[PDB]
Amino acid sequence: MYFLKNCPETARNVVRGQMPISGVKLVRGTGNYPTLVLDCTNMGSQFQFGEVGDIFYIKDVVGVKADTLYIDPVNGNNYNWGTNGTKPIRELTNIAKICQLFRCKSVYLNAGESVITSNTELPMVVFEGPGSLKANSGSSFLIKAGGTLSLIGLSGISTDGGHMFRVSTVEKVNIHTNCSVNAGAAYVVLSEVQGNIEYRQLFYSVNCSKYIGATAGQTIAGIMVKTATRPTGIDAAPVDGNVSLTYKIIE
Amino acid sequence: ILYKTQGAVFIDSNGGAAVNNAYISRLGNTNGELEQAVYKPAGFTEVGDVAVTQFAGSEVKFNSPIIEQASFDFVHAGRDTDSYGLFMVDKPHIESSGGKKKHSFYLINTSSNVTLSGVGLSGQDPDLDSMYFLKNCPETARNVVRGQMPISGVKLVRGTGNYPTLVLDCTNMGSQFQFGEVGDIFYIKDVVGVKADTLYIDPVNGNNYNWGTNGTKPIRELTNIAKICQLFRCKSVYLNAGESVITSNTELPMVVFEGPGSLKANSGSSFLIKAGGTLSLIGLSGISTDGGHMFRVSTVEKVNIHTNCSVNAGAAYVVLSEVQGNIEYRQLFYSVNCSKYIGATAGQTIAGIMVKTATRPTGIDAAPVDGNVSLTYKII
Numbered sequence: 001m002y003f004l005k006n007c008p009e010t011a012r013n014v015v016r017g018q019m020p021i022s023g024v025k026l027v028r029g030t031g032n033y034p035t036l037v038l039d040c041t042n043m044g045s046q047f048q049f050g051e052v053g054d055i056f057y058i059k060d061v062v063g064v065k066a067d068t069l070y071i072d073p074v075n076g077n078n079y080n081w082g083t084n085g086t087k088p089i090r091e092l093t094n095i096a097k098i099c100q101l102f103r104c105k106s107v108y109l110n111a112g113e114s115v116i117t118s119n120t121e122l123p124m125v126v127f128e129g130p131g132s133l134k135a136n137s138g139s140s141f142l143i144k145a146g147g148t149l150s151l152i153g154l155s156g157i158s159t160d161g162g163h164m165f166r167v168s169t170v171e172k173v174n175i176h177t178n179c180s181v182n183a184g185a186a187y188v189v190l191s192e193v194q195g196n197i198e199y200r201q202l203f204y205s206v207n208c209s210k211y212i213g214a215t216a217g218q219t220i221a222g223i224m225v226k227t228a229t230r231p232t233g234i235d236a237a238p239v240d241g242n243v244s245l246t247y248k249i250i251e
Numbered sequence: 252i253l254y255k256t257q258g259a260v261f262i263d264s265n266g267g268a269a270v271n272n273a274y275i276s277r278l279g280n281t282n283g284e285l286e287q288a289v290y291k292p293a294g295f296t297e298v299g300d301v302a303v304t305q306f307a308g309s310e311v312k313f314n315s316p317i318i319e320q321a322s323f324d325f326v327h328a329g330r331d332t333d334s335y336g337l338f339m340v341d342k343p344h345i346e347s348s349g350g351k352k353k354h355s356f357y358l359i360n361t362s363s364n365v366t367l368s369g370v371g372l373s374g375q376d377p378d379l380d381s382m383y384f385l386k387n388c389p390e391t392a393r394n395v396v397r398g399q400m401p402i403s404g405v406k407l408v409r410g411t412g413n414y415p416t417l418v419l420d421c422t423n424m425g426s427q428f429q430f431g432e433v434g435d436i437f438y439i440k441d442v443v444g445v446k447a448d449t450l451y452i453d454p455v456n457g458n459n460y461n462w463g464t465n466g467t468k469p470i471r472e473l474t475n476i477a478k479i480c481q482l483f484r485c486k487s488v489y490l491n492a493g494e495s496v497i498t499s500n501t502e503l504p505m506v507v508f509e510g511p512g513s514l515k516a517n518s519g520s521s522f523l524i525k526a527g528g529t530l531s532l533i534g535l536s537g538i539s540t541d542g543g544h545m546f547r548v549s550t551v552e553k554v555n556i557h558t559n560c561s562v563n564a565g566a567a568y569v570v571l572s573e574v575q576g577n578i579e580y581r582q583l584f585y586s587v588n589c590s591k592y593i594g595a596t597a598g599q600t601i602a603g604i605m606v607k608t609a610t611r612p613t614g615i616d617a618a619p620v621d622g623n624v625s626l627t628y629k630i631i
């Protein structure tokens with residue numbers, strides 16, 4: 001429907017009213033700036049039968065919500081909105097943007113491994129489903145906003161060497177992992193700021209050299225590790241020297 | 252158009268057709284309510300004259316119409332098959348002598364974009380008359396309202412069907428919270444750029460038709476308080492004297508509750524906590540249940556429960572986490588009763604507890620929570 005060519009950063013291409021009844025692909029473009037704005041746009045059944053096309057070009061959304069974002073590394077299509085279960089997207093590249101735009105409460109991971117190869121932000125929502133999350137090429141998942149990130153019942157989350165979650169916000173961050181967690185020789189959580197973090201591991205298993213570390217002097221953290229399958233060698237020293245504990249709950 | 256029964260009727264294909272600055276009026280409204288629409292969609296079975304009627308997929312653009320003396324200003328039905336046909340009315344000038352009217356926008360299985368121009372009214376029947384009537388609009392439909400609400404108080408919306416579709420898009424509400432009524436809050440899907448600080452409740456003298464956001468016009472039941480606070484970003488709820496009760500599990504918004512009123516969960520029901528934040532009960536005459544757990548938490552986000560009033564969960568718990576929770580509970584003065592302060596349905600919930608009162612179940616000071624809760628801090 002729209003093709004946005006080299007629209008400047010200050011420009012806004014506002015869309016109001018009702019989208020067509022039949023599915024359409026909304027936007028494509030060229031240039032480094034998003035300018036499309038959904039101003040209370042009545043989307044109808046576009047999430048189920050249409051496509052966004054290129055999510056990069058959407059600058060802001062007002063009054064348009066969806067509860068869940070669906071990801072399918074095997075059958076998904078990135079042209080999709082991803083907010084309807086029959087039309088999931090396939091990559092993780094824009095899940096943070098998409099969830100922020102539509103105020104999604106959860107992310108659904110269909111079977112298969114959802115991977116990243118460069119640092120990628122994760123929205124602070126509930127992740128569920130049979131899929132797994134993998135950070136490859138030394139990349140890390142990024143936590144940039146306060147709130148709670150929950151991994152519930154996934155087939156697991158792991159990395160090929162980089163720290164698992166890099167926190168760059170000073171806001172309170174809760175990380176809840178109720179699935180298999182494997183950071184290898186790295187940390188589950190690395191704070192790049194003077195953080196305030198609460199990490200909760202529930203059953204399944206966890207592996208890492210330290211549960212939480214920080215790049216610089218002190219980051220307050222609270223930790224609960226409820227699983228026998230953990231590196232017991234760090235029960236006495238679960239975090240690096242740059243992290244001070246508020247509480248520690250480990251058997 | 253000067254008419255007796257129906258002003259204008261638009262049916263089936265009329266793509267791109269426009270009707271600008273139309274002046275359509277019934278010749279007076281005497282016995283208007285008794286006219287019977289002749290050409291109308293199946294879903295419209297009400298009696299009364301209709302200035303403008305549209306259905307079967309017709310989508311004529313109505314720009315600045317002037318509609319006078321009608322029982323129904325507009326009756327519009329989307330196409331039966333897929334709800335196709337947007338109801339488009341921009342700045343309608345609606346008036347009727349003696350404030351006689353049934354509905355301005357009777358919308359069936361459809362979407363709409365309407366811009367109000369600070370002109371309009373709702374009829375003399377305190378129960379049935381409303382600006383909008385939304386009949387079986389589907390889940391995917393949106394009936395958007397922009398512009399200025401009438402100066403005089405009106406009842407905004409009523410409807411039938413299982414899905415809310417009304418949207419307040421930066422609607423200028425004027426003094427409607429104080430003098431008007433929402434009608435049926437259920438049909439409002441969302442609200443943008445319209446806020447109110449407090450939601451007022453009075454279990455005996457309140458009226459559910461009211462918005463509830465102005466102190467002179469509180470609502471009555473607790474059923475939709477979470478939804479209302481969410482739509483209007485309320486910071487607090489004011490409970491006037493009396494017992495506000497629930498008999499089914501009902502969500503409580505995470506805001507400050509104040510006033511001399513009390514909260515009661517009956518029929519074994521529980522109050523629900525579905526979002527993170529802080530729920531504060533400050534100075535209420537108390538909160539209690541007839542046997543159900545007081546607060547059932549179903550969110551994994553950080554939840555703070557601050558009770559500065561009398562609390563009685565009986566043999567039940569003040570808080571029950573239905574997920575792997577993260578809760579902080581603080582009881583300040585007054586009194587607290589329960590078998591355990593916090594419990595959970597399964598796999599460990601973390602919590603911090605502060606109980607500052609001599610009137611508490613002293614025998615659980617050493618074991619304040621059930622086996623599925625692990626304490627971060629305990630101050631008693």
Ligand SMILES: OC[C@H]1O[C@H](O[C@H]2[C@H](O)[C@@H](O)[C@@H](O)O[C@@H]2CO)[C@H](O)[C@@H](O)[C@@H]1O
Nearest residue numbers: 289290291292293294306307308328331
């Ligand atoms: O699907 C087309 C249309 O058929 C019927 O409409 C009737 C209408 O009710 C009568 O008042 C008269 O105008 O004849 C029409 C058909 O010839 C359905 O009642 C209506 O819902 C539907 O849209």
